[PDB]
Design a protein around this nucleic acid. Structure first.
Ligand SMILES: [Mg+2]
Ligand SMILES: [Mg+2]
Ligand SMILES: [Mg+2]
Lengths: 143, 67, 141, 206, 318, 106, 223
RNA sequence: UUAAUUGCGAUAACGAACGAGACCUUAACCUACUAAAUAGGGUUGCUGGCACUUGCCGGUUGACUCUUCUUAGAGGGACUAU
């Protein structure tokens, strides 16, 4: 009857997207991978190391698909959490913005994410198609 | 918790005394009657009075009552 | 022109507006199908308006729910409430009364919150305390 | 009997668990007998619930606590200790796990086992601190069914919590073990031991 | 008296309040539109299967207070209700839709009355005034009748050939029953007779007979086409509703005790109706609020305070 | 001559509710009299201005607080008319306490 | 121009308060009671209520004009955008502030305090008020200070009908040994209200029924 | 008896006032009104992706209309009702 991303278990979809990205090789890794925090209020870099920036990218793409217009600050806000400030109560701290920006740039390069009027970023038609395909694949796997 | 004050009960009694014909049984009608006749300032107070009157009426249809 | 009604569900702060339409049998929450929602352990709450009265009523009714406010659990509850309302509303409007009554009975017997929206609401905090009733630690030395 | 699909197609499992039996987490609330005269009407079962999470207005009146599904009560009890406090989803999950464990071991309905545990960890006679002046001497006294239920519920939870304090044995497993001990009156369980002690004390004081 | 020993058949249940009015349509026999205190309006259709003499079809949720009096149109498509929320609503029966909202009354609307053409509506309210409406939602004649409450307005049927004037009687908490005409557009006669307070003034299938009753515990029948004084019955208790039948010169009156049935001019006070209830102490008991006869003269429909609509049937002794 | 229909937005702000309502009613009446293109008196969410003060001047005592709150009623009305007519409408129907405000033109 | 709406409102209030303060400071001998502000098109309308109107007026534009000028200097308006109007305080006894002022004046003059209080009470009564309460706090003979309390009539104390009917006034009187404080309450008649509720919320009065001679057997009036 | 000198009562006291209560603000309900491109929807234009039959998720203040959710005016509603 028809498939879209909105109809898929989310985590699984994300995983699939990541896998696809890996297969491609195409994205542009800036080379901050295996050095950086992801969120500036964290005790550790990723517990996968080799990759998961792909995963992040996929997640971002999914988010974009879900919404209309998405920016960098917003992304940071979404992805950041509660920093342990010592013997002091926790606070919401925005994620590493540069990484997000890089991801966005990569997406743009690929042809998935597109700069929009008003401000921020939306989805490209090719990108949408790709997403749909991924969703379909996921569904098939589930079946 | 719910025990009615002088300003409810006395008023209700007075109403009953004045208007036993045409102040009958069910609540809504009684309330309406109260609204018509008595110069009650608040709504809630009026409602309370009406309720009390209804109660009194109910009590009446089982024998006479003091005061 | 299609037979359709607009029923809501409310819990705490959360509101879920469900549009019940004539057609094929769609149950969608924020655009995503009923099969998801995903606090996951509370997935069966959202199923309770479906399975308590049966999928037989759902063959012609299409439900599109938009959920805003509250938390997650609350949102789920609201959605459930909306779903419960919607079918009943439809029955009242475009089907028949007996059926509606039956549905109500089915709902009412298992859980109260499905039709009657929950009474409870946050008590305001007042001074000299952390919460609404709980005061600070008084000390006499 | 009869699977009919819609526009948004539902998984088969859900369809299966529908009209005939209103199953709990994924098995029947039916069978499961209250095998005790007294503690009937004070252990709920009967009304078939799907999740151990209802909204509930159970502390409103007086005996609104008694009309609450026992699973829910158990979950609530589990919810305790301030670090854990709130977070009922977690409690529910734990309960589910426990149920699964019970199903795995000695079969039966896990619900039945739970019921048995509840029955067999509620003390029959308690002692109140009545001095007749101020002396710490105690008096032998009968116990309400509701009270018996409540204490039983508490005790098992407490035991589970204790077990969980520095352990690989995730709370759920511990809880299941406790339940097993209770249903088949063991004295290796904590709650049961406590109950026994209480009984002994009562006997002494009488 | 003679033959007809009335038998309880069904107890039609599906309400959560006092069923304050019921009416069968002037042409169609199978419909019975029940209005209640729970703001609803349930349409019942005659089935004649086991106990269920009728099952619910359509509930008309669209009022904020008591639905007090309901009158069906000439045929059986429109149903007009009078509510305690100062308005009236015109309903389409097969649909589940409302049509017209009647704004004007500065007080809770008690009784509605539609004409034999279903052209000119007229309504009485706890307001001191009676109003003329049409099938759009528009005010015509505003009757400045009584100095106290108006309670019941029902339009009388006429056969003897045309006048240009249709006639009705206005009950009140004013002690005075008053007849009007509408196209002199004004008064016919004042039927001063009641000592206490009037609840119901009901015209018959005759037209020249209209019974008046209330808290008085008495039933003062009035002659309309001669404009003159007539019969006065005792009923002991307050009369909640009056009903004539297309069966005889019957008069069925709902008292505070139960339901008392009389012959009109050969004044015999015959049959009483009282059902059973569970529990109960002294002078309470659920009394019938409003009763309707079917156009056949076959079935008594009795709406109770206990939410139930009890159906009584004609059963001859031999 | 003058009659070219513009886009007119009129703001009303006060602390007194009744007065504001009266003003609104007056405006509507005026509109009716002039029978023009009308958008209703759209009501904006009332703004409660909060203040918290220790009841004490000195500081000694049981720490008791005040909640001095001032509620603002803001309501707008949209009209399509010539400006002169609007001016005429708004030059009268002024009650003390209510702030009458005109945007005027698109 | 270009200031937040809530903020603007706040500022207005502040301005009003300031004006009131100024009036209290200046027009004490004239017996100032109340100010009204009307921000109409072009001009701001300040209505003053004082006991001595003539004095306020001056040499028909001697004192009032000066006041206007001062106002202009202060809040920065154009010469012709502020107008002042002195008025009669209708019933001086029903105004608490006025009463307080009078009391203060009396004290200054050197009247017996108790006597003065009594006089004030009498005046209030005459004015037709339901109740008066006058508290005079301070050192009234001897160093150890005491608040004397002179009262008559009704009075309420608790609830929302307090801000409805009870009018209050507090003025501190300066004397060469220490400060007095004069606190005056007036309970206005609920029936004589103009705008608002016309009674105390608890007061329920029922109307009387009319006489009946009803029965006397049917009969019909015909037309 | 009640949260209460709150009442029922008993009674050289009788009827009253302040306080309590009433009140007011707020929080709850309103498919009943009065409304909205500074709230939200519906159809429908154009339009993006889908399965590819009609059907599903979208982007656009392109139209037209609606007020359930929204805000907030006027009301109603509970009086321990049955
Ligand atoms: Mg930590
Ligand atoms: Mg008081
Ligand atoms: Mg108080």
């Amino acid at each position: 009857p028809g498939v879209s991303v909105r109809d898929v278990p989310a985590q699984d979809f994300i995983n699939n997207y990541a896998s696809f990205l890996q297969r491609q090789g195409k994205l542009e890794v800036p080379g901050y991978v295996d050095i950086v925090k992801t969120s500036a209020g964290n005790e550790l870099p990723p517990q996968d190391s080799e990759g998961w920036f792909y995963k992040r990218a996929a997640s971002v793409a999914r988010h974009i698909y879900l919404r209309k217009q998405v920016g960098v600050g917003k992304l940071n806000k979404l992805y950041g959490g509660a920093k342990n400030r010592g013997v002091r109560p926790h606070k919401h701290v925005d994620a590493s913005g540069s990484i997000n920006r890089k991801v966005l740039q990569s997406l743009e390069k690929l042809g998935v994410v597109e700069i929009s009027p008003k401000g921020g970023r939306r989805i490209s038609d090719n990108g949408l198609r790709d997403l749909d395909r991924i969703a379909a694949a996921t569904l098939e796997d589930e079946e | 918790g719910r025990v009615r004050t002088k300003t409810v009960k006395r008023a209700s009694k007075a109403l009953i005394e004045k208007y036993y014909p045409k102040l009958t049984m069910d609540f809504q009608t009684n309330k309406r009657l109260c609204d018509e006749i008595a110069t009650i300032q608040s709504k809630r107070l009026r409602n309370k009075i009406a309720g009390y009157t209804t109660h009194l009426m109910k009590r009446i249809q089982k024998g006479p009552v003091r005061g | 022109t299609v037979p359709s009604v607009q029923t809501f569900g409310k819990k705490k702060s959360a509101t879920a507006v469900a549009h019940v339409k004539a057609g094929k049998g769609l149950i969608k929450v924020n655009g995503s199908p009923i099969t998801l929602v995903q606090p996951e352990i509370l997935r069966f709450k959202v199923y309770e308006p479906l399975l308590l009265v049966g999928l037989d009523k759902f063959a012609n009714i299409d439900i599109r729910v938009k959920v805003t406010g509250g938390g997650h659990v609350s949102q789920v509850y609201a959605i459930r409430q909306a779903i419960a309302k919607g079918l009943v509303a439809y029955h009242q409007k475009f089907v028949d009364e007996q059926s509606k009554n039956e549905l109500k009975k089915a709902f009412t017997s298992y859980d109260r919150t499905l039709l009657i929206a929950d009474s409870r609401r946050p008590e305001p905090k007042k001074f000299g305390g952390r919460g609404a009733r709980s005061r600070f630690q008084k000390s006499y030395r | 009997f009869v699977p009919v699909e819609l526009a948004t197609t539902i998984p088969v499992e859900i369809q299966q668990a529908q009209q005939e039996i209103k199953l709990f987490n994924k098995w029947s609330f039916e069978d499961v007998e209250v095998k005790d005269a007294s503690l009937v009407d004070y252990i709920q079962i009967s009304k078939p619930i799907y999740v151990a999470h209802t909204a509930g207005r159970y502390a409103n009146k007086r005996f609104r606590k008694a009309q609450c599904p026992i699973v829910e009560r158990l979950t609530n009890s589990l919810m305790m200790n301030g670090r854990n406090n709130g977070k009922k989803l977690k409690a529910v999950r734990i309960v589910k796990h426990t149920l699964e464990i019970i199903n795995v071991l000695t079969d039966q309905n896990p619900l039945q086992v739970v019921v048995d545990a509840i029955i067999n960890s509620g003390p029959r006679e308690d002692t109140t601190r009545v001095g007749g002046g101020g002396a710490a001497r105690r008096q032998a006294v009968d116990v309400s069914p509701l009270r018996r239920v409540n204490q039983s519920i508490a005790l098992l939870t407490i035991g589970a919590r204790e077990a969980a304090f520095r352990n690989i044995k995730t709370i759920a497993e511990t809880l299941a073990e406790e339940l097993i001990n209770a249903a088949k009156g063991s004295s290796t369980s904590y709650a049961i031991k406590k109950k026994d002690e209480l009984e002994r004390v009562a006997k002494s004081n009488r | 008296s003679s033959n007809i020993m009335l038998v309880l058949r069904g107890t039609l249940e599906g309400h959560n309040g006092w069923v304050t009015s019921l009416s069968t349509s002037a042409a169609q026999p199978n419909l019975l539109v029940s209005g209640s205190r729970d703001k609803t309006l349930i349409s019942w259709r005659l089935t004649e299967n086991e106990q269920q003499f009728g099952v619910p079809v359509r509930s008309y949720k669209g009022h904020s207070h008591i639905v007090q009096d309901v009158v069906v149109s000439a045929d059986g498509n429109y149903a007009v209700s009078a509510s305690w929320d100062k308005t009236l609503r015109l309903w389409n029966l097969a649909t589940g839709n409302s049509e017209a909202r009647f704004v004007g009354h500065t007080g809770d609307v008690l009784s509605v009355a539609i004409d034999a053409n279903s052209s000119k509506i007229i309504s009485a309210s706890r307001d001191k005034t009676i109003r003329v409406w049409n099938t759009v939602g528009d005010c015509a004649y505003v009757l400045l009748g009584h100095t106290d409450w108006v309670t019941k307005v029902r339009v009388a049927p006429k056969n003897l050939v045309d006048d240009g004037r249709i006639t009705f009687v206005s009950a009140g908490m004013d002690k005075i029953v008053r007849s009007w005409s509408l196209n002199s557009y004004r008064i016919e006669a004042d039927f001063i007779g009641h000592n206490n307070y009037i609840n119901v003034v009901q015209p018959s299938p005759d037209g020249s007979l209209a019974a008046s009753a209330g808290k008085d515990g008495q039933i003062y029948v009035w002659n309309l086409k001669h404009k003159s004084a007539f019969m006065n019955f005792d009923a002991k208790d307050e009369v909640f509703a009056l009903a004539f039948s297309p069966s005889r010169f019957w008069l069925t009156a709902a008292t505070a005790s139960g339901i008392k049935i009389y012959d009109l001019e050969n004044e015999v006070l015959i049959d009483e109706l009282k059902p059973e209830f569970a529990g109960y102490t002294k002078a309470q008991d659920p009394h019938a609020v409003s009763l309707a006869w079917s156009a056949d003269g076959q079935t008594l429909f009795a709406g109770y305070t206990d939410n139930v609509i009890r159906v009584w049937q004609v059963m001859t002794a031999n | 001559q003058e009659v070219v229909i513009h886009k007119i937005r009129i703001n009303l702000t006060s602390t007194k509710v009744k007065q504001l309502e009266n003003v609104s009613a007056n405006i509507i009446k005026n509109a009716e009299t002039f029978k023009l293109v009308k958008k209703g008196p759209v009501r904006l969410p009332t703004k409660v201005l909060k203040i918290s003060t220790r009841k004490t001047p000195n500081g000694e005592g049981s720490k008791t607080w005040d909640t001095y709150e001032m509620r603002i009623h803001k309501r707008y009305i949209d009209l399509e008319a010539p400006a002169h007519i609007v001016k005429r409408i708004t030059q009268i129907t002024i009650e003390p306490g209510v702030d009458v405000e005109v945007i005027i033109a698109a | 121009a270009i200031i937040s709406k809530k903020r603007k409102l706040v500022a207005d209030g502040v301005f009003y308060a300031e004006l009131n303060e100024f009036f209290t400071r200046e027009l004490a001998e004239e017996g100032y009671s109340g100010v009204e502000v009307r921000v109409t098109p072009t001009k701001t309308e300040i209505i003053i209520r004082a006991t001595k109107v003539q004095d306020v007026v001056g040499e028909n534009g001697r004192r009032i004009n000066e006041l206007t000028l001062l106002i202009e200097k202060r809040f920065k308006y154009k010469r012709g955008t502020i107008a002042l109007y002195a008025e009669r305080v209708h019933d001086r006894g029903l105004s608490a502030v006025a009463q307080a002022e009078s009391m203060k004046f009396k004290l200054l003059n050197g009247l017996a305090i108790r006597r003065a209080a009594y006089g004030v009470v009498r005046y209030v009564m005459e004015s037709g008020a339901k109740g008066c309460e006058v508290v005079i706090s301070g050192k009234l003979r001897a160093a150890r200070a005491k608040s004397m309390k002179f009262a008559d009539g009704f009075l309420i104390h608790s609830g929302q009908p307090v801000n409805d009917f009870i009018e209050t006034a507090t003025r501190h009187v300066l004397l060469r040994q220490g400060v007095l404080g004069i606190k005056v309450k007036i309970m206005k008649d609920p029936s004589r209200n103009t705008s608002g509720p016309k009674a105390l919320p608890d007061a329920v009065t029922i109307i009387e029924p009319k006489e009946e001679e009803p029965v006397l057997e049917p009969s019909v009036k015909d037309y």
